[PDB]
Design an enzyme around this catalytic site. Structure first.
Site, PDB file in Angstrom:
ATOM      1  N   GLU A  48      -3.100  -0.143  -3.695  1.00 35.79           N
ATOM      2  CA  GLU A  48      -2.771  -1.350  -2.964  1.00 35.79           C
ATOM      3  C   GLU A  48      -3.020  -2.565  -3.826  1.00 35.79           C
ATOM      4  O   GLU A  48      -3.984  -2.607  -4.594  1.00 35.79           O
ATOM      5  CB  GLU A  48      -3.549  -1.439  -1.636  1.00 35.79           C
ATOM      6  N   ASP A 106       0.852  -1.190   0.000  1.00 35.00           N
ATOM      7  CA  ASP A 106       0.000   0.000   0.000  1.00 35.00           C
ATOM      8  C   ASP A 106       0.886   1.238   0.000  1.00 35.00           C
ATOM      9  O   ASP A 106       1.633   1.469   0.958  1.00 35.00           O
ATOM     10  CB  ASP A 106      -0.891   0.033   1.241  1.00 35.00           C
TER      11      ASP A 106
HETATM   12  N1  LIG Z   1     -11.129  11.455  -3.568  1.00 39.62           N
HETATM   13  C1  LIG Z   1     -10.961  10.680  -2.496  1.00 39.62           C
HETATM   14  N2  LIG Z   1      -9.844   9.968  -2.367  1.00 39.62           N
HETATM   15  C2  LIG Z   1      -9.647   9.157  -1.300  1.00 39.62           C
HETATM   16  C3  LIG Z   1     -10.607   9.040  -0.312  1.00 39.62           C
HETATM   17  N3  LIG Z   1     -10.149   8.158   0.575  1.00 39.62           N
HETATM   18  C4  LIG Z   1      -8.958   7.741   0.159  1.00 39.62           C
HETATM   19  N4  LIG Z   1      -8.651   8.349  -0.989  1.00 39.62           N
HETATM   20  C5  LIG Z   1      -7.441   8.165  -1.815  1.00 39.62           C
HETATM   21  C6  LIG Z   1      -6.257   8.973  -1.279  1.00 39.62           C
HETATM   22  C7  LIG Z   1      -5.159   7.926  -1.112  1.00 39.62           C
HETATM   23  O1  LIG Z   1      -3.956   8.428  -1.696  1.00 39.62           O
HETATM   24  C8  LIG Z   1      -5.659   6.727  -1.915  1.00 39.62           C
HETATM   25  C9  LIG Z   1      -5.220   5.543  -1.059  1.00 39.62           C
HETATM   26  O2  LIG Z   1      -5.873   5.704   0.201  1.00 39.62           O
HETATM   27  P1  LIG Z   1      -5.346   4.995   1.541  1.00 39.62           P
HETATM   28  O3  LIG Z   1      -6.657   4.899   2.464  1.00 39.62           O
HETATM   29  O4  LIG Z   1      -4.721   3.679   1.299  1.00 39.62           O
HETATM   30  O5  LIG Z   1      -4.409   6.023   2.348  1.00 39.62           O
HETATM   31  P2  LIG Z   1      -3.180   6.836   1.689  1.00 39.62           P
HETATM   32  O6  LIG Z   1      -2.343   5.892   0.918  1.00 39.62           O
HETATM   33  O7  LIG Z   1      -3.796   8.021   1.048  1.00 39.62           O
HETATM   34  O8  LIG Z   1      -2.435   7.270   3.050  1.00 39.62           O
HETATM   35  P3  LIG Z   1      -1.756   6.123   3.954  1.00 39.62           P
HETATM   36  O9  LIG Z   1      -0.233   6.559   4.196  1.00 39.62           O
HETATM   37  O10 LIG Z   1      -1.895   4.763   3.394  1.00 39.62           O
HETATM   38  O11 LIG Z   1      -2.437   6.222   5.404  1.00 39.62           O
HETATM   39  O12 LIG Z   1      -7.082   6.778  -1.797  1.00 39.62           O
HETATM   40  C10 LIG Z   1     -11.783   9.772  -0.416  1.00 39.62           C
HETATM   41  O13 LIG Z   1     -12.648   9.694   0.453  1.00 39.62           O
HETATM   42  N5  LIG Z   1     -11.968  10.611  -1.525  1.00 39.62           N
HETATM   43 MG   LIG Z   2      -2.009   4.105   1.103  1.00 40.34          MG
HETATM   44 MG   LIG Z   3      -4.944   1.607   0.312  1.00 42.46          MG
END
Ligand SMILES: Nc1nc2c(ncn2[C@H]2C[C@H](O)[C@@H](COP(=O)(O)OP(=O)(O)OP(=O)(O)O)O2)c(=O)[nH]1
Ligand SMILES: [Mg+2]
Ligand SMILES: [Mg+2]
Ligand SMILES: [Mg+2]
Ligand SMILES: [Mg+2]
EC number: 2.7.7.7
Length: 342
Positions: A107, A8
């Site tokens: 992921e 991820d």
């Molecule tokens: N537009 C939009 N994008 C989202 C939302 N939730 C998550 N994302 C996007 C932003 C993240 O870069 C991508 C992957 O989400 P993740 O939940 O795996 O977390 P991310 O990788 O952003 O941060 P992390 O270091 O894994 O905690 O999904 C949402 O509610 N709206």
């Molecule tokens: Mg992530």
């Molecule tokens: Mg993810």
DNA sequence: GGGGGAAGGATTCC
DNA sequence: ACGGAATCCTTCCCCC
């Protein structure tokens, strides 16, 4: 039996934005989805850890983030750019396993069973994989390793950010008794709450409830799933997922129930949906609307043949009329969803 | 009784 | 208070 390595990417969108403009590194960064109703209307796609530290995160209103971090850098979500950077990284992971399941845009799971032997080696492949991606794309990721997908994922949640973790058979058994049921993938608030009512605050707690009771409360699927894990028997295979739906649903400047006011956003939605369908032909169409009270209503139709843009344009209006006709509330967000490709 | 499907919605965050 | 998309559940249907 089977060894699984899950990957991820870290604060993915915000990290890609930093890669494209490293000067941002070190500063709090918020990627936003500006709904357009006003100044900073809309929500936060995601933020990098600097900002995530003061409560700024995915889902909160931009305006709220602005109040907390007035001087952070706010960028509009550019999903296309991230999508390509994602594909590239997915192509690298393929070099470590043909058995690959791309879960989301950030992921993927890899079955490295007949590729490595024992966790000590799996862990090494993990590090190579991290250093590899870090080298090519300059994108840090987290890796989780275990006997099945679910646990692999959890090990990564535990290891974030920029980490790597192995949950071995002994720990799986410990976690089953320790892990909070709501920290299990596929368990949101709705399900967690219902779960507490049966006094199931841990995975193991499910092994002591008549299956009939579980099924009745949360559904057969969710119950088999859960009991399965608790029983240390969950083992879904790692398969490539195949796109089944394509759609887009936008927000209007102002709520409405006026057809000539809504139509334009709808037609706009159909247009982007088609450029995205690419060469695919859908036989099913669904018009979706988010009422003023953030409720979600939908109407659709399945034809005995594929749907041409003309047919979609025309048919969506009817469905949209059905909705206004059948629901008294104003419409806030309108869009379309195409499915059942040929 | 129950297979098979289509429709509208619930729930998740993958 | 954005928004793309999968999976699953309930209800309704047509029919043998
Ligand atoms: N537009 C939009 N994008 C989202 C939302 N939730 C998550 N994302 C996007 C932003 C993240 O870069 C991508 C992957 O989400 P993740 O939940 O795996 O977390 P991310 O990788 O952003 O941060 P992390 O270091 O894994 O905690 O999904 C949402 O509610 N709206
Ligand atoms: Mg992530
Ligand atoms: Mg993810
Ligand atoms: Mg949860
Ligand atoms: Mg998330």
């Amino acid at each position: 039996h089977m060894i699984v390595l899950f990957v991820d990417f870290d604060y993915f969108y915000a990290q890609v934005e930093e890669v494209l403009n490293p000067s941002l590194k070190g500063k709090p960064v918020v990627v936003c989805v500006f709904s357009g109703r006003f100044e900073d209307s809309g929500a936060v796609a995601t933020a990098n850890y600097e900002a995530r530290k003061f409560g700024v995160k995915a889902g909160i209103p931009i305006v709220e983030a602005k109040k907390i971090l007035p001087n952070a850098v706010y960028l509009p979500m550019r999903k296309e750019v991230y999508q390509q950077v994602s594909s590239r990284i997915m192509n690298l992971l393929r070099e470590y396993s043909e058995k690959i399941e791309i879960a989301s845009i950030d992921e993927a799971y890899l079955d490295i069973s007949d590729k490595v032997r024992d966790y000590r080696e799996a862990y090494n492949l993990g590090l190579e994989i991290k250093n590899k991606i870090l080298e090519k794309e300059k994108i840090t990721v987290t890796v989780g390793i275990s006997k099945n997908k679910v646990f692999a994922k959890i090990a990564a949640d535990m290891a974030k950010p920029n980490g790597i973790k192995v949950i071995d058979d002994e720990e799986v058994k410990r976690l089953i008794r320790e892990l909070d049921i709501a920290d299990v993938p596929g368990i949101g608030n709705i399900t967690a709450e219902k779960l507490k009512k049966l006094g199931i605050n841990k995975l193991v707690d499910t092994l002591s409830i008549e299956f009939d009771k579980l099924k009745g409360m949360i559904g057969e699927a969710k119950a088999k799933y859960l009991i399965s894990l608790a029983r240390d028997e969950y083992n879904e295979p790692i398969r490539t997922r195949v796109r089944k739906s394509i759609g887009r649903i936008v927000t209007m400047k102002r709520n409405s129930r006026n057809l000539e006011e809504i139509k334009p956003y709808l037609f706009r939605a159909i247009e982007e949906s088609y450029y995205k369908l690419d060469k695919r032909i859908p036989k099913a169409i669904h018009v979706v609307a988010v009422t003023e009270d953030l409720d979600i209503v939908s109407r659709g139709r399945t034809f005995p043949h594929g749907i041409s843009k003309e047919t979609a344009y025309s048919e969506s209006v009817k469905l949209l009329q059905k909705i206004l006709e059948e629901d008294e509330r104003k419409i806030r967000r309108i869009g379309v969803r195409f499915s059942k490709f040929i």
